[PDB]
Design a protein around this ligand. Structure first.
Ligand SMILES: [Zn+2]
Ligand SMILES: [Zn+2]
Ligand SMILES: [Zn+2]
Lengths: 56, 196, 208, 93, 64, 175, 227, 111, 161
């Protein structure tokens, strides 16, 4: 529903991997993993450029 | 429809509207008068929908002050026609006709294309200015660019349609050029040779 | 103080001919303007059963025929009714029904269409006099009236829904054909003929 | 002088929170504006804390003066230091 | 403050191109067009939103 | 993609008033009606209109891939027949208060048995389910105005190995 | 039901099932399909014979041209006023580009009331020569939109004594907006319109009456065909 | 609020008479002039609360996505209501709730 | 009634996949294109106009051509020796051909003068496999095997060279 600030409504996963995630928790966890992948694949080029300038 | 002026800077917070085939931006009051509604009260009637909201009226006040210099439909259309990126030296009546053309067509074409149907265009302009003011007065968040219900997917159909439109226009131009060349010889062309 | 622009006092002695009215409004010169829906038509002509039967048109397109049937059966009509006393009276198939809540409804046969009234200010009805080039006012149009179907189960609404649903189902512009030969054969044979006549014309011009 | 009047209502709570005096604000306005503007200020005990002003077509001039006053009247503090926090530091001595 | 700008307009008396200069004074609300060859001067009032195209169109209207 | 002309005909039939007859001072409570992003008119009883449009779409009178969106907060009613909208199907819960079946799925075991057989008891496939009003399509924009149960068990109100479902206690009741 | 005989039979079935408005019992028998509310009063729906010859246009004022909004104009013309109900409109067009409408009204309340009473009581063949003078009030800019179909719009008037409802066709819609006269054209403006217009009421000529009857013969030929 | 001209519908700018010492609203497009009732020429709110409760519609009870509570209505004492937070969306906006009854449809707080 | 189990939901999903398949969007879009979009694009600018106010007795001559109907056929293969035969996707894959069909347009010519036309081949459009205009749409399971096509193949692609 609208204006829900409970932990389950905003991305708290109360189950374990052994117990199994619910679909909402599954989607939120996928969002977080996508964030991780984007962050790595975006910061790599900046780090490489900084390293090259330092070496030169 | 840009909203110039920063908070507490640049004096008045004028609202200028960008138009197709027009070299410089235009204040909203002048184009509103050009569409054919002169009185300022009716411009505010079109834009705002609740008179008790003094804040949006205050934000529209600099636009009214700037547009007060123009007070007639025809001078407004002429002002549109000077900046219309056309060939220099066009006469006043032809400038007004060019402004009428560039205002009827190419200005919100998805609404309508016929003459004397500009009431809906004025109402839609009021709606756009109202949305701009509602976002500017921190009453609503800016639109989510990444929202997926505002996106569309082009499958094989639309892509092939765009490609075929380009290629058919090329073929039509080739047919036109061959016809122009052939009319020099003045022959009853079979028309199965123009098509490539 | 905006001074009056016109002060010449010139006056035209124009006299307008006016005809008596068959009816006169009582208590208020008010009229209600009603938009005509697509499913409703007005037939001011008197109902003539034999020409009506002789002019029924049948089309292959089922949707167009169904729309024509619906608008024809729903058309507002009138006819002369021979009274039992030997006189002639005007008889109509349309009535206006007012419910207990004060709302009005237009009834044609068994079909009933509700009326939604919206108050309108500074709206009047005028009569045009083209021969003199002036407009003579008649009365005031206080309310604008829209006609709405009463319910889903009404036959008019079901026929309209069926017609509009099946109208957009039929969509086939391209027509199939069978190719028996090379499509480029015409182009190459006409190019060969054109090259031959170009050679002949060049030879003739050099020989002329 | 001019018939136009300029009075501004200041929030009592935040004015007391910053630990400021109305006389101080009046002296700041007087210093930045010399005698070009006559200034009066309601006392502390007033229900609503107000401070008026009077100039000595000028509606737009008064509007520009009010905007300038709201913009760049510095009561106290170092310019550029937007906010200040208190921090505790564990130091070995 | 007078503003002098070189314009690519065409004089209707000498027919030479790129010899038109627009001089507008916003303080006195006036605009002067001078031909570098014909030495003719055209005066027309200007407004706060005036541009050299406005004075050029005014000159075109005056010429015809 | 679908033509918008029948949509305009249906709207004008059910009491929509054009823009030329619209006064913003008089209509301080009317709903703006958009069709494919074009403001075409206004209406003063949007509830009946949206109910009628949704019932017509569920019956097959309007194409199932047409979007019907009612923004109550902004007083807007938007309709989309554009091409390129991504949609997905969902079960329909009987939300009519006056009905006895309120709060229950419209699809029953009779529909499942008909699907398994392959024909109606005086071809019965997915399209038959869609045009019978037990399933409908929604796109991302229309999803903002609906309330979706995750499982049919959610429609009716201490093991260490079974996963735990949200309580959803913020609301006293859910429709 | 594609049979023409079936369509004709349906037409006569609809014609025969008309409920008599005086029949209170049959009126109460009728029930709203959705509202489930009984009927109170009924009126017959008939066309108008005396007005089909004339041409009717729905005239509306757009925006600030509203008479209620213009408070000094409304006060001058009276705070329904017979002056408004008896006003005259005079379209004059100098050229295709420039066009406007001239509005005239009766300032005096007694003269306007007498003219309105005389006009609304025309049922005999005696009309008094009411030389009424109309004074110009204001001018407005106009636009016109035409109806593709004849009976696109129709205005309904009621008649309680006969339990009927007469409707008239609408040819087009005229919209008016306030026009500010250019100061450089007032010299030509003063030569176009007039400060006063005198209306004389006279009996219609026989030839014009015959022409109007011939026009009405399209609708009603039983009572108006020439012999 | 600002008034408009009664004859040409333009804005009525305030004007001051040197000889008469009066505040008058005058249209710059004509000679019309009407006497002002109040001296409040201009008012600017640095911190404003308008639009917080102004975003209310009369059909908000038909929205199925809004949560439903059992708070007591101050007017008709109903047992069903629909609540939501502030419609203003600035960073300083409070998290207080506005409750709407399903019978009288008025907006009331809990404090 | 009776409650709806998860198996009923999977029955409904099976009905969905029995009706639509997995590549229905591609085939439906291509069918819409071929059926209506080509005709609409042709009718977007249906009139080419050439005028010539000849004075060499003033005769104002307008020359204009109109575009009519679009005709499509099943894909065909034209050999070097001049013969033609119906093409199938396996042959196009093996011989590096393009699986495409000819498009015909009706051009009508008129000769306007004031004193004061059959099917033309406009090109070949590649055909999406298993669509309404593909040869494999009709073939049943046995002839599909005889044509060396895999019955598990779903279509939704083109064969260019
Ligand atoms: Zn020169
Ligand atoms: Zn004024
Ligand atoms: Zn209550």
């Amino acid at each position: 529903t609208k204006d829900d600030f409970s932990p389950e409504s905003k991305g708290f996963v109360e189950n374990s991997y052994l117990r199994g995630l619910t679909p909402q928790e599954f989607f939120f966890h996928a969002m977080a993993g996508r964030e991780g992948l984007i962050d790595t694949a975006v910061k790599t080029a900046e780090t490489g450029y900084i390293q090259r300038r330092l070496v030169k | 429809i840009k909203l110039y002026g920063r908070e507490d800077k640049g004096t008045g917070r004028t609202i200028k509207a960008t138009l197709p085939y027009v070299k410089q931006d235009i204040p909203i009051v002048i184009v509103f008068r050009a569409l054919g509604v002169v009185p300022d009260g009716e411009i505010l009637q079109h834009i705002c929908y609740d008179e008790n909201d003094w804040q949006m009226l205050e934000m529209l006040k600099p636009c009214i002050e700037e547009g007060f210099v123009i007070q007639d439909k025809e001078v407004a259309l002429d002002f549109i026609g000077r900046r219309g990126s056309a060939a220099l030296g066009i006469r006043r009546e032809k400038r007004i006709q060019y402004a009428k053309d560039i205002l009827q067509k190419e200005l919100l074409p998805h609404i309508t294309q016929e003459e004397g149907f500009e009431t809906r265009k004025t109402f839609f302009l009021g709606y756009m200015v109202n949305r701009l003011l509602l976002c500017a007065l921190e009453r609503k968040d800016q639109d989510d660019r990444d929202h997926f219900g505002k996106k569309r997917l082009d499958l094989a159909g639309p892509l092939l349609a765009n490609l075929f439109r380009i290629l058919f226009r090329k073929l039509t131009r080739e047919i036109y050029r061959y016809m122009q060349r052939c009319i020099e010889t003045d022959r009853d062309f079979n028309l199965n040779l123009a098509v490539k | 103080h905006t001074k009056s622009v016109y002060d010449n006092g010139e006056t035209l002695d124009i006299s307008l001919p006016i005809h008596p009215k068959s009816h006169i409004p009582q208590g208020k010169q008010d009229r209600w303007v009603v938009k005509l829906p697509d499913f409703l038509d007005i037939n001011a002509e008197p109902f003539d059963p034999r020409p009506f039967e002789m002019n029924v048109k049948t089309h292959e397109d089922k949707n167009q025929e169904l729309l024509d049937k619906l608008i024809a059966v729903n058309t507002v009509r009138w006819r002369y009714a021979k009274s039992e006393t030997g006189g002639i009276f005007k008889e109509t198939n349309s009535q206006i029904i007012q419910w207990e809540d004060g709302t009005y409804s237009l009834r044609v046969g068994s079909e009933i269409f509700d009326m939604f009234t919206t108050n309108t200010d500074d709206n009047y009805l005028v009569s045009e006099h083209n021969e003199e080039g002036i407009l003579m006012t008649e009365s005031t149009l206080s309310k604008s009236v829209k006609l709405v179907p009463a319910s889903f189960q009404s036959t008019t609404h079901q026929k309209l829904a069926k017609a509009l649903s099946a109208k957009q189902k039929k969509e086939s512009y391209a027509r199939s054909v069978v190719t028996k030969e090379d499509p480029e054969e015409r182009q190459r044979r006409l190019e060969s003929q054109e090259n031959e006549r170009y050679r002949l014309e060049r030879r003739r011009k050099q020989a002329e | 002088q001019s018939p136009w009047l300029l009075r501004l209502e200041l929030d009592r709570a935040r004015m007391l929170d910053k630990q400021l005096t109305m006389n101080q604000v009046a002296d700041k306005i007087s210093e930045v504006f010399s005698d070009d503007l006559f200034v009066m200020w309601s006392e502390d005990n007033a229900d609503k804390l107000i401070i008026r002003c009077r100039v000595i077509e000028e509606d737009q001039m008064l509007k520009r003066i009010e905007a300038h006053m709201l913009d760049l009247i510095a009561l106290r503090g170092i310019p550029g230091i937007s906010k200040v926090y208190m921090v505790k530091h564990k130091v070995s001595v | 403050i007078k503003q002098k700008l070189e314009t690519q307009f065409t004089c209707l008396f000498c027919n030479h191109d790129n010899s038109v200069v627009c001089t507008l004074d916003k303080k006195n609300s006036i605009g002067l067009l001078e031909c570098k060859k014909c030495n003719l001067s055209f005066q027309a009032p200007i407004n706060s939103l005036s541009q050299p195209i406005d004075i050029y169109s005014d000159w075109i209207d005056a010429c015809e | 993609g679908s033509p918008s002309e029948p949509i305009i005909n249906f709207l004008e039939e059910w009491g929509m008033e054009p823009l030329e007859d619209y006064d913003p001072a008089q209509h301080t409570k009317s709903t703006r009606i958009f069709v494919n992003g074009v403001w075409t008119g206004i209406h003063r009883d949007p509830s009946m209109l949206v109910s009628t449009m949704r019932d017509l779409r569920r019956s097959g009178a309007i194409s199932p891939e047409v979007s019907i969106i009612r923004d109550i907060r902004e007083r807007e009613f938007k309709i989309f027949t554009d091409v390129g909208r991504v949609y997905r199907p969902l079960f329909i819960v009987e939300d009519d208060e006056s009905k006895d079946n309120k709060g229950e799925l419209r699809i029953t075991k009779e529909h499942i048995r008909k699907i398994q057989q392959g024909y109606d008891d005086d071809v019965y496939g997915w399209s038959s389910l869609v045009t019978s009003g037990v399933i409908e399509y929604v796109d991302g924009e229309e999803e903002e105005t609906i309330m979706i149960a995750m499982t049919p068990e959610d429609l009716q109100t201490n093991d260490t190995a079974k996963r735990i479902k949200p309580e959803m206690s913020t609301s006293s009741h859910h429709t | 039901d594609t049979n023409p005989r079936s369509q004709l039979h349906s037409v006569e079935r609809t014609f025969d099932e008309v409920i008599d408005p005086r029949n209170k019992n049959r009126l109460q028998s009728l029930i709203h399909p959705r509202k489930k509310i009984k009927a109170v009063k009924a009126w017959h729906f008939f066309p108008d014979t005396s007005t089909f010859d004339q041409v009717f246009h729905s005239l509306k004022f757009v925006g600030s041209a509203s008479l209620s909004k213009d408070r000094p104009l409304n006060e001058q013309l009276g705070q329904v006023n017979a002056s408004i109900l008896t006003s005259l409109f005079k379209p004059i067009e100098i050229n295709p580009h420039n066009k406007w409408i001239s509005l005239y009204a009766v300032t005096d309340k007694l003269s306007a009331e007498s003219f309105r009473k005389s006009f609304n009581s025309i049922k005999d063949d005696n009309i008094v020569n009411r030389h009424v003078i109309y004074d110009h009030i204001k001018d407005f800019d106009q636009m016109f939109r035409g109806h593709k179909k004849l009976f696109e719009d129709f205005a309904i008037s009621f008649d309680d004594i006969s339990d009927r409802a007469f409707f008239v066709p609408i040819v087009g819609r005229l919209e008016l907006k306030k026009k500010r006269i250019v100061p450089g054209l007032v010299d030509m403006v003063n030569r176009t319109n007039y400060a006063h217009i005198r209306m004389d009421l006279r009996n219609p000529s026989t030839q014009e009456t015959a022409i109007r009857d011939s026009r009405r013969e399209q609708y009603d030929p039983v009572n108006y065909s020439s012999i | 609020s600002f008034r408009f001209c009664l004859e040409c519908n333009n804005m009525l700018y305030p004007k001051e008479d040197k000889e008469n010492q009066r505040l008058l609203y005058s249209c710059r497009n004509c000679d019309y002039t009407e006497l002002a009732e109040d001296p409040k020429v201009y008012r600017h709110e640095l911190i404003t609360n308008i639009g917080e409760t102004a975003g209310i519609v009369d059909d908000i009870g038909q929205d199925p996505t809004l949560p439903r509570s059992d708070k007591e209505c101050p007017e008709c004492h109903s047992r069903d209501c629909v609540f939501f937070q502030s419609q203003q969306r600035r960073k300083d906006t409070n998290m207080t709730l506005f409750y709407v009854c399903l019978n009288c449809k008025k907006t009331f707080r809990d404090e | 009634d009776d409650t709806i189990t998860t198996e009923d939901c999977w029955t409904v999903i099976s009905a969905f996949f029995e009706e639509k398949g997995l590549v229905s969007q591609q085939l439906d879009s291509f069918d819409e294109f071929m059926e209506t979009s080509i005709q609409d694009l042709v009718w977007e600018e249906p009139r080419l106009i050439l005028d010539q106010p000849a004075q060499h007795d003033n005769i104002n001559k307008r020359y204009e051509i109109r575009f009519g109907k679009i005709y499509l056929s099943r894909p065909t293969m034209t050999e070097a020796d001049g013969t033609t035969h119906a093409m199938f996707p396996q042959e196009a894959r093996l011989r590096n051909l393009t699986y495409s069909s000819p498009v015909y347009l009706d051009m009508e010519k008129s000769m306007f003068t004031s004193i004061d036309g059959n099917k033309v081949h406009i090109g070949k459009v590649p055909i999406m496999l298993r669509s309404k205009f593909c040869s494999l749409r009709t073939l049943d399971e046995v002839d599909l095997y005889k044509m060396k096509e895999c019955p598990y193949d779903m279509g939704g692609y083109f064969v260019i060279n």
